[PDB]
């Protein structure tokens, strides 16, 4: 596909600078953190309710199976 | 004759001590970095690049010219040929990569600038 026939973009003025000059972790801490939380919530705000769905389906399904299985002899009263 | 006849109207107006010794021109660290413009409409790409060089006062610049002399210069307007005393030139005579190329050497008194300058 090459660089010669991608797309005819016009004016753009890039300003890259060498890694060797600049630090590997520029404000990587205090600046990086808020963005992390900011987008983390951006995912969980949508993703979470499926997690709760799977959670209640898991827990209720498990207790469903166990109550359906172990409790039975008491529920039978074979001494009837 | 050009000495005595030379005018010396207003006198120099500057300090003569340590106070005036501070440079009017800063020492300048080199910055290996890249700037790019895409006007695709431009008939063709014109690229140059530069390494940090000796200050103009510095004699260290002098041998480098001979080094630049190895790079030489070339352009399509010459007599051409792959035989010629330069590699990039014969390549320019071959795949025609360089319509022209040349090693600029602009050394400033502080810090200089070796580099290349070419048409492809
Ligand atoms: C069992 C085996 C499972 C194995 C799973 C492996 C995980 C897969 C993976 O690595 O890619 C996911 C993902 C890839 O990175 P991404 O940037 O989030 O994806 C971008 C997408 O556009 C989707 O994300 P986004 O577009 O919504 O936004 C990205 C953002 C939010 O997306 C997220 O969900 C990540 C949330 C935490 C951020 C991670 C950084 C931790 C510090 O993530 C960030 O890093 C925020 C930007 C911070 C930049 C700061 C840098 C300084 C300059 O990384 C993870 O989230 C790891 C998840 C592993 C835990 C799963 C727990 C489930 C229970």
TrEMBL record, chain A:
Cell location: Mitochondrion inner membrane
Membrane topology: Single-pass membrane protein
GO biological process, one term: thalamus development
Membrane-crossing segments per the record: 43-61
InterPro entries cross-referenced by the UniProt entry: Cyt_bc1_su8, Cyt_bc1_su8_sf
Pfam family, one: UcrQ
Protein name as it appears in the record: Cytochrome b-c1 complex subunit 8
Domain of life: Eukaryota
Main location: mitochondrion
Family that this chain belongs to: Belongs to the UQCRQ/QCR8 family.
PANTHER family: CYTOCHROME B-C1 COMPLEX SUBUNIT 8 (PTHR12119:SF2), UBIQUINOL-CYTOCHROME C REDUCTASE COMPLEX UBIQUINONE-BINDING PROTEIN QP-C (PTHR12119)
One term under GO cellular component: respiratory chain complex III
Organism of provenance: Sus scrofa
Keyword Transmembrane: yes
Gene that produces this protein: UQCRQ
Subunit structure: Component of the ubiquinol-cytochrome c oxidoreductase (cytochrome b-c1 complex, complex III, CIII), a multisubunit enzyme composed of 11 subunits. The complex is composed of 3 respiratory subunits cytochrome b, cytochrome c1 and Rieske protein UQCRFS1, 2 core protein subunits UQCRC1/QCR1 and UQCRC2/QCR2, and 6 low-molecular weight protein subunits UQCRH/QCR6, UQCRB/QCR7, UQCRQ/QCR8, UQCR10/QCR9, UQCR11/QCR10 and subunit 9, the cleavage product of Rieske protein UQCRFS1.
Keyword terms of this UniProt record: Electron transport, Membrane, Mitochondrion, Mitochondrion inner membrane, Respiratory chain, Transmembrane, Transmembrane helix, Transport
Chain's role: Component of the ubiquinol-cytochrome c oxidoreductase, a multisubunit transmembrane complex that is part of the mitochondrial electron transport chain which drives oxidative phosphorylation. The complex plays an important role in the uptake of multiple carbon sources present in different host niches.
TrEMBL record, chain B:
Span of domain Peptidase M16 C-terminal: 1-120
Entry annotated with the keyword Mitochondrion: yes
One of the record's GO molecular function terms: metal ion binding
Subcellular location: Mitochondrion inner membrane
One GO cellular component term noted in the UniProt record for this chain: mitochondrion
Family the entry assigns: Belongs to the peptidase M16 family. UQCRC1/QCR1 subfamily.
Name of the protein in question: Cytochrome b-c1 complex subunit 1, mitochondrial
Organism: Sus scrofa
Region of the whole protein represented: 241 to 360 of 480
